[PDB]
Design a protein around this ligand. Sequence first.
Ligand SMILES: Nc1nc2c(ncn2[C@@H]2O[C@H](COP(=O)(O)OP(=O)(O)O)[C@@H](O)[C@H]2O)c(=O)[nH]1
Ligand SMILES: Nc1nc2c(ncn2[C@@H]2O[C@H](COP(=O)(O)OP(=O)(O)O)[C@@H](O)[C@H]2O)c(=O)[nH]1
Ligand SMILES: [Mg+2]
Ligand SMILES: [Mg+2]
Lengths: 165, 161
Amino acid sequence: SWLSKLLGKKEMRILMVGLDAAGKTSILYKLKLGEIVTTIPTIGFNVETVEYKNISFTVWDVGGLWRHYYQNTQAIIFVVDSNDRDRIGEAREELMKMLNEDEMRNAILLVFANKHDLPQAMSISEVTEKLGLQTIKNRKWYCQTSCATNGDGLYEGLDWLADNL
Amino acid sequence: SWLSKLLGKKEMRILMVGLDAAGKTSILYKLKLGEIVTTIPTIGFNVETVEYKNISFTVWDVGGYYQNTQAIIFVVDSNDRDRIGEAREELMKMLNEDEMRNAILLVFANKHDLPQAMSISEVTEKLGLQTIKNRKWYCQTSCATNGDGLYEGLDWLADNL
Ligand SMILES: Nc1nc2c(ncn2[C@@H]2O[C@H](COP(=O)(O)OP(=O)(O)O)[C@@H](O)[C@H]2O)c(=O)[nH]1
Ligand SMILES: Nc1nc2c(ncn2[C@@H]2O[C@H](COP(=O)(O)OP(=O)(O)O)[C@@H](O)[C@H]2O)c(=O)[nH]1
Ligand SMILES: [Mg+2]
Ligand SMILES: [Mg+2]
């Protein structure tokens, strides 16, 4: 479904970021679009890439030069650990910094509220409020619950992304 | 060349482990042997792999694939005094595994560039390396940022297989 709408001749660049241990690597792997490749453009800055035909997913941790990899980004996936209540405030701050980058002003926002399987995970209502998504103007956004370990939620989120480019 | 020595017909499997943040991914990237590929064979277990001709490096974090292993590289953060005991415990666990009794051991005392780093004698001591019998081992200081020490360590590894 989403695969159909994303594939083509023109490069499709997706940025997936979030705090460490949000589940970003696990998501890449569960997509099955090919090998996860790690590069280190500078020491301490680990970048994971999955490239399949015209589609690129670029992943790194935030909250710890970036502007280079923002070129022609069409979507931001922001992954959050729904169970990490102590760092939701940090996640909000890193998301808002991303959303103030002019280079990516026309990128749509998909938020995965990940680790939905966990007994004290925040609800999608809670994650949406605490990330301040309602405050977003002139950008399409969606927040989608996910479990990156069984893959629940991932295709639903990507389907929305593909439909709204 | 440490590379030319490892090269040949016979498979050469190296296992590189250590605590998270020890410097293992950085070391792999510095080796320039090929793309680093991540797999997740089981939930929560991230494995990085570099394969070049007959040589494969397999990397994962311990703390917090043993068949035909010719060498173990253990990477320790020389500047992390609070966790070196944990590094010792995980190293000793691995060296007790039957499947790998025949593997030689290279220890990289990494992050040697940092001004407060433990000296090699102290790393050696706090890892209990001297207590290891019936295994060839070597401790080498390294800096993964600029490659200091890496070639020296790998050359010892290639020589002593
Ligand atoms: N329970 C649960 N654990 C998850 C989920 N997604 C990721 N994890 C675990 O959280 C840890 C961090 O995952 P990882 O993908 O490496 O996060 P990254 O640092 O953002 O790339 C790993 O142990 C994962 O197995 C999830 O949806 N549910
Ligand atoms: N100062 C210094 N920092 C290092 C060295 N090796 C790695 N690092 C840093 O330590 C952090 C963790 O290294 P990484 O390769 O990701 O460790 P891994 O978790 O064992 O794969 C990164 O911020 C690196 O920049 C080193 O030799 N010296
Ligand atoms: Mg990751
Ligand atoms: Mg690593």
